[PDB]
Structures are given as C-alpha cells and as structure tokens.
C-alpha cells in the first residue's frame, strides 16, 4: 500500500525519475514552452514540485532552512505569477533545478529512512510526493497542449492489442438508499495518514439518502459523440446552455498544439478533433492517429458534455451518485476507496502516465465498480454536474490553499486521468475543472433521466 518506508521511497523515486524523463527529454529550445493559460514551464514545475517538499515536510517537521532561500518566493504558486514563470533570469537552468530536485529527493528520502515514522510525518511525506504527481500530470497535459513529443514513458497508441468491445455496455440501475460519501475527518480518525488519507476537499464524510438512478457502465465513446457532431449538435444552439452558447461563441486558435499558423475560429468539434479526407482524427501529443470508435472522448468541455446529455436525452451523474456508483460504500459496511477494494493494482485501470486514454472503454474488467461500471477510477477525469463546493464541515489542510481557489467556479471531476499517478487516486477524491476547459484529460458517463 503506502504505508511502508518502502513504499514511499520507492514511489518518491518513481516520481522523481518521472519529473526527470519529463524535463531531460526536451531540447532546450522546447524548455521555454509556447504561452498557454493552463501550461508552465517545465523546468518551472520540477522546482516548485521541489519547493513543496523543503516548505511542508523538510522545514515543517525540522526547520531545516531552504536550498537556496532567494527562490522560497519564486517556486511558490501562489505568490508567482503564471506569466512571470516565463522568465529565464529569475529561475536556474535545467541543469542547476535538477541538482536542486535530487538534492531535495535524497534529503526526502534521508528523512524518510533516518527519523521515526509518526503520523505526523507520514500524511506530510504522502501529501508532498502526492503533490509532485500532480505536477507530473501537469507536466504531461503541457505536451499534449502545446504540441510536443509525448512522454518518454508513455504508449500514446494505447491499449492496440486488447482491442476489445464487450457486452458489458448498458445502464446499472442503483439500489437506492442510504450511502457514506467521503473521508473521515483528519481530528476523527487515528488512521488520517494511514487508511483515512485524504485532501480537505475529500472530508469530512456524509451520509445521503440517495434516490435510485440508471448510470452508463461505459464511458461516452468516440463514435457515440461523433453522433453529435455530424448530426450538427455544436451548431444547434437548443442542446447547449447560457454558458455552453458562450462557450459556442469563443473565437480561439484552433491550430494551437498544431505546428500550423494560428487559425482563429469558433470550436466545432473536440478541440483535438480533425477530419481528414472524410476519416476523423486526432493528436496525439505531435502525432495526428485516427480516431478509433470504442475509445473514450477526451479533452472535451463540460458544455460539450452537457450538450451531448441534451441530445442523447441522458443526464450527468451528481459527484455523490459518481461515488455510490464506484464504491457502493454504506454507513455501518465495509468501505472501499477503489471499486475493486483497498488494495490498489495499476493494471486495473488507465493511470501512471501509459496508454493516455486510448483504451477500450470496456477494458480493465477487473476494475470494476460492485454495479458493473467499469474504468470509473482513471481513464478520463469524468465531469459531474455538481460545482466544486466545500462538504459541509469543510478544515482546510496544513497546505490551505489546494481546494480554497477553486470552488464554485470549478466543477467538480471525479475518477482519475491517464495522465494521473494511481498513488494519489481514490474513489473520494475530487479534482476541480473549469467548466471551459478542453486542455485537460476530461470525459463523462451518461446517467438516464
Ligand atoms: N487543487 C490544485 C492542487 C494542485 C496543486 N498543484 C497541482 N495541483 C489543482 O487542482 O490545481
Ligand atoms: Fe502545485
Ligand atoms: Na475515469
């Protein structure tokens, strides 16, 4: 699991060696990315991925000074400013942040190794590798958006060999009743870094009479959303919202990623979407690869989404109906925080950076939820209708600000992307998404109205 001296330090230099592969594979005429408002420069990343563990483990637990005190202001992301990252006279060279990132890793991994193994110590240890996987999806989506190779570590093509479409497609209708939804609170547990691990967006746990509903066990297909866009759905103002027509209207680069000129236009597909000679397409980091049917639809808006359930006449899942359909956890039963159980295997699911969402919809059985749905927990961070909102006890955590910022605004996703790392993800967790957003590994499942 992750409870080990072990675990951790091996999961720290899987990280690191992740961040490593990600910045080292790049020329340094590709470290300074093209401007985009959810991209950032990558050396940038590896330095503040670094600074979070110096700030709320290293300094935090034994007020160990900083590596190199005049970027304590630098490598904070609330205190820099995106635009400023671009910089390359206020940060050191890739060469320079690397030294700093193995500096930091081994100390970590000193730590980790050399003082006792409390509580306390574990949920920092955990929250700041966590942190820097967080980043290396990041670092990873920058790619995809800005039109660079992809990831030395990653199979873009996907899951080829298992091409694969059971029967497995159709609606689980859910018992109704009563269900536990989220994470004990950090005060309420003695397990808060251990079985309870969670970030405050995941506590505190609830309970909900939840009414009966019919969800799709399979995500929204490539050939199902085709549908929508030859049956003209994005140009029939009907199936979209006051902010979905907004959205309609924006005039964006359509060639952004492309290494073509920019072409100023309206979205009428997915973003990556292309057709070419009749026969749809789709980039994949600086490749264009055809569009295969059973795949999920990714890197599509919540408008898009939303759409698509207007036309097809189904509905997206609440975040709570999200989380019954994919733990089936009940007050007073046994809890899972994955839908196979609590031990996690990342050959159950599309995470860790691999096949980037080009799987069968209908693979990884064995990840299946208790009703059937599959590929819940990863794949594409599935949409929900809900907006990111504090459950009702909300604490923030020792870091205040990783929910704070995004409520309201946000929409709440849940599962997990291909681009996520599987040590972090949870049938709780929640990730805050920008409902105009389409550079970051976004699908849905239908429920039925
Ligand atoms: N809530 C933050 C957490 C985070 C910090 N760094 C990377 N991710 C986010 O989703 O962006
Ligand atoms: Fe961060
Ligand atoms: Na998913």
Sequence with gaps: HMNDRESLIQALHHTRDRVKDLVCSLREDQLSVPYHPGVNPPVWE???????????????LDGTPSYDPSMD??????????????????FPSREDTLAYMDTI??????????????????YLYRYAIYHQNMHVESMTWCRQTVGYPAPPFAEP???????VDQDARGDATIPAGRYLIGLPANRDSDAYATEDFGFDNEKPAFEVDMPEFSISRTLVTNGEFQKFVEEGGYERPEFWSQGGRKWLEREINLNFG????????????????????GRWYERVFDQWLPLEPGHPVKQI?????????????????????????????????????????NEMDPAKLDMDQRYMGRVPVTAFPAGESPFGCRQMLGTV????????????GFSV???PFMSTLQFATHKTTKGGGCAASSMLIRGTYRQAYHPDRCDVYTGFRTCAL
């Excluded at 890793?105 to 574990?122: G, H, S, V």
């Excluded at 997206?316 to 809890?335: C, D, I, Q």
């Design 46 to 60: 590896m330095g503040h991925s670094t600074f979070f563990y110096e700030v709320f483990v290293l300094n935090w």
């Design 73 to 90: 202001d630098l490598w904070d992301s609330f205190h820099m400013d995106h635009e400023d990252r671009w910089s390359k006279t206020l």
């Design 105 to 122: 890793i081994q100390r970590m991994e000193d730590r980790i190794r050399n003082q006792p193994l409390t509580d306390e110590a574990l």
């Design 157 to 163: 093509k996907g899951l080829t060999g298992e091409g």
């Design 258 to 277: 492309s290494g073509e000129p920019p072409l100023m236009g309206r979205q009428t597909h997915p973003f990556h979407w292309r057709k070419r000679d």
């Design 301 to 341: 808006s919540y408008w898009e989404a939303e759409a698509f359930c207007a036309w097809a006449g189904r509905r997206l899942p609440s975040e709570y109906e999200w989380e019954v359909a994919a733990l089936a956890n009940k007050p007073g039963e046994e809890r899972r925080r994955y839908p196979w159980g």
């Design 381 to 392: 961070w599935e949409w929900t209708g809900n907006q990111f909102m504090p459950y009702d």
């Design 397 to 399: 955590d020792m870091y």
